[PDB]
Amino acid sequence: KIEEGKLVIWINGDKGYNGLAEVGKKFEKDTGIKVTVEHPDKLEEKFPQVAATGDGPDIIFWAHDRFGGYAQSGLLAEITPDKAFQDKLYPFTWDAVRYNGKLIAYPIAVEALSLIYNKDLLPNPPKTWEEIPALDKELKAKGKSALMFNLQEPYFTWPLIAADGGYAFKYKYDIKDVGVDNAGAKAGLTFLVDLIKNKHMNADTDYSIAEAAFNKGETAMTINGPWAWSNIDTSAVNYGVTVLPTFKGQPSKPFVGVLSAGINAASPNKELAKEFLENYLLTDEGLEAVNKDKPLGAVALKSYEEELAKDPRIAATMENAQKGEIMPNIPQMSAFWYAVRTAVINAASGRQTVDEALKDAQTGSELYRQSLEIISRYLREQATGAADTAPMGASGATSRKALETLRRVGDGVQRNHETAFQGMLRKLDIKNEDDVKSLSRVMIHVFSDGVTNWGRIVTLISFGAFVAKHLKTINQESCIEPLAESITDVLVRTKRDWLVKQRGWDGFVEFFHV
Numbered sequence: 001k002i003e004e005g006k007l008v009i010w011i012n013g014d015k016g017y018n019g020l021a022e023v024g025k026k027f028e029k030d031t032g033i034k035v036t037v038e039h040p041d042k043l044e045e046k047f048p049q050v051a052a053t054g055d056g057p058d059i060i061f062w063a064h065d066r067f068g069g070y071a072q073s074g075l076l077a078e079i080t081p082d083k084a085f086q087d088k089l090y091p092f093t094w095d096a097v098r099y100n101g102k103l104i105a106y107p108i109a110v111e112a113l114s115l116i117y118n119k120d121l122l123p124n125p126p127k128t129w130e131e132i133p134a135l136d137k138e139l140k141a142k143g144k145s146a147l148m149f150n151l152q153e154p155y156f157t158w159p160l161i162a163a164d165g166g167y168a169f170k171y172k173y174d175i176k177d178v179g180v181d182n183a184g185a186k187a188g189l190t191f192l193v194d195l196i197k198n199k200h201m202n203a204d205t206d207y208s209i210a211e212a213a214f215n216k217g218e219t220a221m222t223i224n225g226p227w228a229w230s231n232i233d234t235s236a237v238n239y240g241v242t243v244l245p246t247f248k249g250q251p252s253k254p255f256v257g258v259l260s261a262g263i264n265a266a267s268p269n270k271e272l273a274k275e276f277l278e279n280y281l282l283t284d285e286g287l288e289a290v291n292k293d294k295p296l297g298a299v300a301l302k303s304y305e306e307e308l309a310k311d312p313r314i315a316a317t318m319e320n321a322q323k324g325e326i327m328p329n330i331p332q333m334s335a336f337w338y339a340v341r342t343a344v345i346n347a348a349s350g351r352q353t354v355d356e357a358l359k360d361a362q363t364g365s366e367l368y369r370q371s372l373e374i375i376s377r378y379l380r381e382q383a384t385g386a387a388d389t390a391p392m393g394a395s396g397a398t399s400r401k402a403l404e405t406l407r408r409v410g411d412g413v414q415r416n417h418e419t420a421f422q423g424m425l426r427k428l429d430i431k432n433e434d435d436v437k438s439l440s441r442v443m444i445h446v447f448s449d450g451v452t453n454w455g456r457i458v459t460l461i462s463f464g465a466f467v468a469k470h471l472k473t474i475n476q477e478s479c480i481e482p483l484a485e486s487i488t489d490v491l492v493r494t495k496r497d498w499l500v501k502q503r504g505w506d507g508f509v510e511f512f513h514v
C-alpha cells in the first residue's frame with residue numbers, strides 16, 4: 001500500500017512542519033529520496049485507522065502518550081538504535097517511548113504548558129488561580145480580560161484538574177485506580193466552570209480564539225506550549241513565560257508530552273526513516289531547523305538541549321514539567337482523553353453538572369478494564385468449571401453483580417441457542433493459536449455489523465464463553481485471555497458512547513435485574 005523509495009511524514013499543524021520539510025529537503029540532497037511532510041487534521045485519530053490496513057505515513061509524530069495504543073495494535077516497527085545513538089538523547093526521553101520493554105519511537109522534545117502573560121498589561125502575573133476573578137474584574141474596566149486558553153482540548157485544563165488530587169492512573173501505572181471523579185478533580189473543574197459562569201472565560205473559547213486574543217493584546221494571559229512562542233514573537237507582544245498558578249496552594253500539574261517519531265510497521269522504507277530520524281532530524285542542525293519554525297521545548301538531544309537550556313522560556317517550561325507528571329503511554333490513554341474532553345466541554349457549556357460529567361468520565365476511563373475483568377472471568381470459569389478466587393478491586397460490587405447477572409443470562413443464551421453455537425463452532429476450524437486470531441477477526445465483523453442493545457452484547461460474550469469451553473477441551477487454555485481481550489476490545493471500541501449512556505455495567509445489572 002505504502003509506496004517504496006519515498007518518506008511520507010505526519011506531524012501536527014501547531015508544530016514546525018516547514019522546518020521539518022527543510023530537513024526533508026537536505027535528506028533528498030544526499031539520497032535522492034523525496035520527503036513529503038503532511039499535517040492532516042485529527043492525525044492521532046486517522047493514524048491508527050489507516051495503519052491497521054497497512055496504509056498511512058512512514059513516520060508519525062505525536063506526543064508519546066498515544067504510541068502504546070499504536071504499539072498494542074502492532075502499528076509500529078520496533079526501533080533499534082545502537083548505544084552510541086541512545087547516549088546522544090536523555091535516558092528519561094527514551095523511557096517515555098518504551099512499551100513492553102521495546103523502544104517504539106524516537107523521542108524529539110519535552111513539552112509542558114506554561115502560563116504566558118503580557119508584561120505591558122500584567123507586570124507581575126498571578127501566583128494563584130484564586131486571584132484571577134479579581135484580576136479579570138480589574139482588567140475588564142480597562143477593556144481587557146485576564147485569561148483565555150483553549151477549553152476544547154482537556155490537555156489545557158488538566159493542570160488545574162490535577163492540582164488538588166486529580167489523576168488519570170495512580171503510579172508502574174495502576175489501570176484499576178482512576179482519579180478522574182475524586183474531590184480534587186471536582187474542585188479543579190468546579191473552579192473552571194465558576195470562571196465561565198461568572199463571565200471571566202467563555203465555554204466556546206478554542207485554540208484559535210485564545211491565540212488571536214493574546215497576540216492582539218486583548219487578554220493578559222494564555223496557557224500554551226513552546227510551539228506557540230513563534231506567533232507571539234511575530235505579534236511584538238512583550239510576553240513572559242512563567243510557572244502556572246497554584247490551586248488551593250497546590251501547584252498546577254500539567255501532563256508532560258515527549259514529541260516522538262514512530263515508524264509505521266507497514267512501511268517498505270524503515271531503513272530510510274531510521275536514517276532520516278537518527279542522522280538528519282536528531283542532530284544540532286536538524287532540530288535547529290524545526291525549532292526556528294516552531295519551538296520544540298526541551299529537546300531530547302543533549303548536545304542541542306545544552307544550548308537552549310539557557311533560555312528562561314525553556315527554564316519555565318522545565319519548571320512546569322517538574323511540578324507535573326510525564327504522561328502514561330498505556331493503550332487506555334486514548335479512552336481517558338476522550339472521556340475527559342467530553343466532561344470538560346459539557347461542564348463548561350452547562351449541558352451536564354461537574355458531578356454528572358466527571359462520573360461519565362470515570363465510567364469511560366475505567367470501562368475497558370471493568371469490561372475485561374467481567375468478560376475474561378466469565379470465560380475462564382465457564383471453561384474450567386471453577387470461579388476465580390481473586391478479588392475484583394475498585395468498583396468490585398459492579399464487577400461481582402455484572403458477573404452474577406452474566407452467569408444467569410449467559411448460561412440461558414448458551415443453553416437455548418446451543419444448536420447454532422455448535423453449528424457455527426463446527427463451521428470454523430479452531431485447532432491452534434493462529435485459528436483463534438482468525439475467530440477474533442470474524443466476531444469483530446459480525447458484532448460491529450448489527451444494532452446495539454444488551455441482548456447482542458450478552459450474545460457476543462456468551463459465544464466467547466462457548467468457544468472458551470471448546471478451547472479448554474483441545475488443550476488451548478492459553479488462547480482464552482486473548483479471546484477475552486478481543487471481545488472486550490470490539491465491545492468498548494465500537495459501543496463506548498452507548499455503554500457510558502447506560503451507566504456501563506450498572507445499567508447491565510439493572511436491565512437484566514429480576
Ligand SMILES: Cc1c(-c2c(-c3ccc(F)o3)sc3ncnc(O[C@H](Cc4ccccc4OCc4ccnn4C)C(=O)O)c23)ccc(OCCN2CCN(C)CC2)c1Cl
Pocket residue numbers: 413417420421423424427439442443446447450455456457459460463
Ligand atoms: C454466534 C452467532 C452470531 C454472532 C457472532 C458470531 C458468529 C461467528 C462468530 F465468530 O461470532 S458474534 C455475535 N455478537 C452478537 N450477536 C450475535 O448474534 C446475534 C443473533 C444470534 C445468533 C446466533 C445465536 C443467538 C443469537 O441471538 C442473539 C440474541 C439473543 C438475545 N438477544 N439477541 C439479540 C445477532 O447478531 O443479533 C453474534 C451470529 C449469527 C449466528 O448464527 C447464524 C446462523 N448460522 C447458520 C449456519 N450455521 C452453521 C451457523 C449459524 C451465530 Cl451462531
Ligand SMILES: OC[C@H]1O[C@H](O[C@H]2[C@H](O)[C@@H](O)[C@@H](O)O[C@@H]2CO)[C@H](O)[C@@H](O)[C@@H]1O
Pocket residue numbers: 012014044063064065066111153154155156225257337
Ligand atoms: O487534549 C488531549 C490531548 O492532549 C495531548 O495533545 C497535545 C499534544 O501533546 C501537544 O503536542 C499539543 O499538540 O497539544 C495537544 C493538545 O491539543 C495528548 O498528547 C493527546 O493524546 C490528547 O488527545
Ligand SMILES: [Cl-]
Pocket residue numbers: 193196197347348349350
Ligand atoms: Cl455555565
